[PDB]
Amino acid sequence: RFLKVKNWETDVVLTDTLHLKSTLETGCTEHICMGSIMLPTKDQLFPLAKEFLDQYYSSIKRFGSKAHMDRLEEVNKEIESTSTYQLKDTELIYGAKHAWRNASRCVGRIQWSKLQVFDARDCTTAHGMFNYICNHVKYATNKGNLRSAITIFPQRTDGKHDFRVWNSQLIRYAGYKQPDGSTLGDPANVQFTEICIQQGWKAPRGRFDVLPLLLQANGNDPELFQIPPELVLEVPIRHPKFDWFKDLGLKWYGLPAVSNMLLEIGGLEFSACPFSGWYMGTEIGVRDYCDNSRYNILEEVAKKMDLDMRKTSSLWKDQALVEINIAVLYSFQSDKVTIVDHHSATESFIKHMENEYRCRGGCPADWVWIVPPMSGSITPVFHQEMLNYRLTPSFEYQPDPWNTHVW
Amino acid sequence: RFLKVKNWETDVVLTDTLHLKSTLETGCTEHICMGSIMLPVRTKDQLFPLAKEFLDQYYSSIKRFGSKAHMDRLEEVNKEIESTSTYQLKDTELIYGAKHAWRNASRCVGRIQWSKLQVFDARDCTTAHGMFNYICNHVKYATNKGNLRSAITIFPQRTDGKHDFRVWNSQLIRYAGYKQPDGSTLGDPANVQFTEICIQQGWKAPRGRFDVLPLLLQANGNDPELFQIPPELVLEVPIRHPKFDWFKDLGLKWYGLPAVSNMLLEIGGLEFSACPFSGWYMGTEIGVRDYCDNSRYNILEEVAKKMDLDMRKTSSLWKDQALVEINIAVLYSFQSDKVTIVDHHSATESFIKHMENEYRCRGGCPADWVWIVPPMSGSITPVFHQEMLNYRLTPSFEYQPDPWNTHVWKG
Numbered sequence: 001r002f003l004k005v006k007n008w009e010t011d012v013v014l015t016d017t018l019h020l021k022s023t024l025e026t027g028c029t030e031h032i033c034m035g036s037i038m039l040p041t042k043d044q045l046f047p048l049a050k051e052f053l054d055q056y057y058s059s060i061k062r063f064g065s066k067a068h069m070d071r072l073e074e075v076n077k078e079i080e081s082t083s084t085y086q087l088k089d090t091e092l093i094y095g096a097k098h099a100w101r102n103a104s105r106c107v108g109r110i111q112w113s114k115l116q117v118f119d120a121r122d123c124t125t126a127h128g129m130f131n132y133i134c135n136h137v138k139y140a141t142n143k144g145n146l147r148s149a150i151t152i153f154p155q156r157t158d159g160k161h162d163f164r165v166w167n168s169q170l171i172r173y174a175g176y177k178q179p180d181g182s183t184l185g186d187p188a189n190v191q192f193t194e195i196c197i198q199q200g201w202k203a204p205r206g207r208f209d210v211l212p213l214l215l216q217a218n219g220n221d222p223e224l225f226q227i228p229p230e231l232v233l234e235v236p237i238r239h240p241k242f243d244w245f246k247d248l249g250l251k252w253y254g255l256p257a258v259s260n261m262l263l264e265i266g267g268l269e270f271s272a273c274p275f276s277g278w279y280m281g282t283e284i285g286v287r288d289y290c291d292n293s294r295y296n297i298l299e300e301v302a303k304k305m306d307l308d309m310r311k312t313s314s315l316w317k318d319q320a321l322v323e324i325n326i327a328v329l330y331s332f333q334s335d336k337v338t339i340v341d342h343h344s345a346t347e348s349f350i351k352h353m354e355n356e357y358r359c360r361g362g363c364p365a366d367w368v369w370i371v372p373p374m375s376g377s378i379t380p381v382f383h384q385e386m387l388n389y390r391l392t393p394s395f396e397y398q399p400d401p402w403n404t405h406v407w
Numbered sequence: 408r409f410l411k412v413k414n415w416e417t418d419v420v421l422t423d424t425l426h427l428k429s430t431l432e433t434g435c436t437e438h439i440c441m442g443s444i445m446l447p448v449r450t451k452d453q454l455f456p457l458a459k460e461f462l463d464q465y466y467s468s469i470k471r472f473g474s475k476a477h478m479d480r481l482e483e484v485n486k487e488i489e490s491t492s493t494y495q496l497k498d499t500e501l502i503y504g505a506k507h508a509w510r511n512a513s514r515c516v517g518r519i520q521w522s523k524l525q526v527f528d529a530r531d532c533t534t535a536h537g538m539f540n541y542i543c544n545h546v547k548y549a550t551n552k553g554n555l556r557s558a559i560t561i562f563p564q565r566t567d568g569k570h571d572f573r574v575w576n577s578q579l580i581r582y583a584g585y586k587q588p589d590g591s592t593l594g595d596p597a598n599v600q601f602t603e604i605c606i607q608q609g610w611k612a613p614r615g616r617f618d619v620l621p622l623l624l625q626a627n628g629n630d631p632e633l634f635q636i637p638p639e640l641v642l643e644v645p646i647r648h649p650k651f652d653w654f655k656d657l658g659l660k661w662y663g664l665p666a667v668s669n670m671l672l673e674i675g676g677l678e679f680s681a682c683p684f685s686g687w688y689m690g691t692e693i694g695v696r697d698y699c700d701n702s703r704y705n706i707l708e709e710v711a712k713k714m715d716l717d718m719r720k721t722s723s724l725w726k727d728q729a730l731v732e733i734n735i736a737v738l739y740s741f742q743s744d745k746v747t748i749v750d751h752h753s754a755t756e757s758f759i760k761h762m763e764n765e766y767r768c769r770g771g772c773p774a775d776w777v778w779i780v781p782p783m784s785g786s787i788t789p790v791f792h793q794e795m796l797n798y799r800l801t802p803s804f805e806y807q808p809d810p811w812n813t814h815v816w817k818g
């Protein structure tokens with residue numbers, strides 16, 4: 001019932017009680033653990049509503065005040081009547097913040113309470129959605145001094161009228177197969193890239209073509225829009241000691257901004273809720289650049305370094321990996337765009353886990369995702385026991401809208 | 408019920424039915440995953456079914472299920488349990504059991520090798536001096552002048568819980584740790600405590616940085632005894648680097664034979680509390696963990712100083728640069744002295760083939776992703792992108808408490 005988590009580097013032991021609030025299921029049972037698996041009515045809504053407003057009013061020291069009872073009353077009235085309800089702005093902000101706070105896979109959560117929330121529930125069209133988004137991009141980019149933020153579109157109603165951003169992130173590079181049979185650009189986005197072509201995006205057919213946004217208001221067919229290049233901050237990647245590096249022609253974008261998730265607050269579903277912060281270096285240099293099914297450049301960098309690529313045991317892949325990641329960080333830092341290294345981020349997240357154990361009674365944490373994809377054991381998250389569990393409010397996955405939409 | 412696991416690099420999907428044979432608990436529930444937690448006297452009552460399951464498995468492994476020999480063995484085991492309260496395994500069943508404990512080890516990345524395990528039967532052993540002798544033969548067989556061979560030795564099983572065979576050391580070969588008055592540690596910090604027990608018991612400590620610990624061996628519930636392994640049997644490797652000549656001047660070395668001595672082997676309900684086993688090293692175990700953990704030899708600073716990296720900011724990645732060089736050194740040294748070792752690219756690639764083959768022949772392969780993925784360069788090994796399923800099968804290897812915490816001293 002009360003659970004203990006140990007850090008095996010520092011012997012610090014934390015006690016977790018927060019998990020007893022866990023409502024949703026994990027995928028695991030007593031027989032099988034599924035921790036490495038990437039994805040596992042009016043009746044229903046009031047319970048969810050009450051659960052949320054109770055924790056909101058608790059959070060503001062008014063649990064069991066007339067204001068609380070009245071809201072519980074007012075929302076209850078509104079559900080029985082409309083079959084849904086609306087959040088006050090204050091509830092909205094709290095709920096989005098808390099959905100970040102509860103994201104068990106996010107290493108960046110020491111920041112959870114600095115989130116700018118843009119309320120876009122008044123939006124009706126894709127052109128609206130485009131406006132709101134470009135404003136979010138520009139706010140968040142802040143000429144390189146990046147700021148956390150989320151833009152929230154109207155909540156689901158009967159599910160024939162969903163708002164969706166079809167892009168997986170607002171800012172991502174094009175992917176194209178060639179007769180050749182290999183891939184030009186980013187292979188992760190091949191299918192979406194051809195979706196945009198199929199809608200009429202004239203494609204530069206380059207390595208690093210920023211994709212057009214494809215936006216669906218109110219359940220309609222979605223529409224293309226080019227984010228103004230002036231709003232897309234990009235970084236050329238060079239190395240602080242290897243002059244040839246820049247001639248690999250690498251660049252990446254400054255703002256990571258996820259746009260395909262579903263935000264659940266108090267029973268209500270916000271199918272479009274794009275959010276951004278900034279990058280931990282390894283996301284780019286280890287994952288986007290080196291993954292076999294991504295830009296997959298390790299071979300070519302190793303060549304330029306003249307390393308012995310005959311044997312895996314020369315650790316040439318690993319040598320190249322480090323230098324790439326030095327280059328990503330150096331470039332961002334040189335250009336003054338915010339970025340965090342994996343050492344600093346995980347040091348941060350351990351400080352934060354400790355805060356949340358102390359103030360909240362725990363912290364859901366998914367070790368599989370929290371531990372970076374390079375140098376695992378030399379970051380402190382490696383030696384930290386974590387408990388994973390699901391709290392609401394929450395971000396959740398949802399199915400790619402092309403597999404669901406009707407034209 | 409059928410379960411699928413996908414690999415996200417290759418889109419290979421696998422199907423799991425083997426987990427239906429799982430009975431032991433994970434620690435997880437529908438509401439909490441415990442997957443990163445390091446660690447989440449039997450009566451006749453519980454013993455016969457455990458014995459029966461095991462022999463049903465042993466007998467289908469040899470294609471004699473339902474056979475007369477299968478049935479007669481059940482009746483013989485059963486009658487022995489209820490007359491003697493326990494039972495003895497035949498040689499063949501002990502072999503098969505130890506092989507399957509490895510095979511069922513979901514945290515082992517080297518299970519490709521499962522079927523090649525030399526099983527020494529030390530169940531005629533009565534005394535500690537007997538134990539030393541069996542261990543020494545193990546260590547010489549397994550070492551094989553640097554051409555390592557996997558082995559396990561299996562002392563008598565538990566009876567009343569008061570006559571246990573234990574090996575007190577955590578590995579058969581490990582370096583001493585000495586906490587100094589100034590609060591620093593000389594040698595290996597992980598073995599400080601055990602080192603302290605050994606001194607108390609009588610060991611004169613050379614007090615250096617790489618002293619091989621003596622064996623501390625309990626037979627038959629008796630107080631344990633101190634033995635020195637013959638150094639001629641302890642194969643060790645000086646660590647040097649192929650380009651950096653100053654590397655050797657750091658004075659590093661390490662032993663070549665990894666051999667776990669503190670786990671409990673369970674086969675058919677039986678508890679074999681001393682079952683040292685040995686294989687060979689994945690390079691990262693030494694290069695990443697043993698040398699560069701903060702709580703172990705912690706050499707990262709001194710390597711990066713010699714390399715004159717920019718240590719003023721973490722974002723130089725001066726740690727990740729030092730870590731790689733040290734790992735290159737460890738693999739280079741071992742290959743140059745012709746001691747078996749495997750790097751983490753090659754070990755993980757082999758595992759992924761093992762794991763697919765197993766899904767095909769066996770219907771599954773329990774696997775602990777937190778453990779299988781190496782502590783450096785995670786995502787550029789193929790295991791990082793492999794979804795795995797973790798569940799527990801018997802026969803199996805288990806943790807047990809350190810014996811100095813439970814042992815009843817006689818004097």
Ligand code: HEM
Nearest residue numbers: 100103105106107108111148150275276277278279280395
């Ligand atoms: C401010 C700096 C931030 C940093 C440095 C950061 C860091 C990360 C990283 C590295 C991941 C793993 C991503 C991957 O491997 O694809 C992650 C996952 C995630 N973060 Fe953040 N984060 C930050 C801000 C945010 C914000 C503002 C939110 C929400 C408002 C958020 C919500 C998430 C969620 C939901 C996931 C997991 C998504 C999934 O399950 O696939 N993070 N975070």
Ligand code: HEM
Nearest residue numbers: 509512514515516517520557684685686687688689692804
């Ligand atoms: C032959 C070469 C072998 C290699 C390269 C190998 C590799 C590994 C490695 C790297 C680990 C993780 C160790 C750690 O993080 O401390 C491991 C775990 C393990 N392997 Fe092996 N292994 C080998 C042979 C064996 C043998 C012979 C057995 C037993 C017969 C065995 C049983 C285990 C067990 C029980 C674990 C997990 C222990 C725990 O939970 O603490 N392996 N394997």
Ligand SMILES: N=C(Nc1cccc(CO[C@@H](CN)COCc2cccc(/N=C(/N)c3cccs3)c2)c1)c1cccs1
Nearest residue numbers: 038039108188256257258275276277278279280283291415
């Ligand atoms: N085939 C896939 N499909 C796939 C199917 C289902 C789920 C996923 C999970 O996608 C994540 C993989 N790393 C990517 O999510 C993007 C993300 C989310 C949150 C934070 C991220 N990075 C940041 N710094 C932030 C973004 C927004 C605020 S901070 C990135 C992927 C692949 C995944 C990885 C390689 S292939």
Ligand SMILES: N=C(Nc1cccc(CO[C@@H](CN)COCc2cccc(/N=C(/N)c3cccs3)c2)c1)c1cccs1
Nearest residue numbers: 008009383445446665666667684685686687688689692702
């Ligand atoms: N306090 C601890 N003690 C501790 C307490 C309980 C469990 C553990 C886990 O033990 C392993 C830690 N890595 C040590 O196991 C050594 C091992 C086991 C199996 C295979 C290994 N390597 C080989 N290649 C083989 C050994 C024998 C056959 S193959 C090494 C450790 C710590 C953990 C982390 C920091 S301190």
Ligand SMILES: C[C@H](O)[C@H](O)[C@H]1CNc2nc(N)[nH]c(=O)c2N1
Nearest residue numbers: 036037038368369791792793794
């Ligand atoms: C199969 C495995 O769970 C999957 O590859 C995970 C592993 N850990 C990860 N961790 C992060 N942070 N991001 C990821 O995309 C993944 N991939």
Ligand SMILES: C[C@H](O)[C@H](O)[C@H]1CNc2nc(N)[nH]c(=O)c2N1
Nearest residue numbers: 382383384385443444445777778
């Ligand atoms: C807390 C966490 O589970 C612990 O640090 C684990 C992580 N993964 C590991 N993986 C292996 N192979 N060996 C280990 O000792 C550990 N330590």
Ligand SMILES: [Zn+2]
Nearest residue numbers: 028033435440
């Ligand atoms: Zn689990």
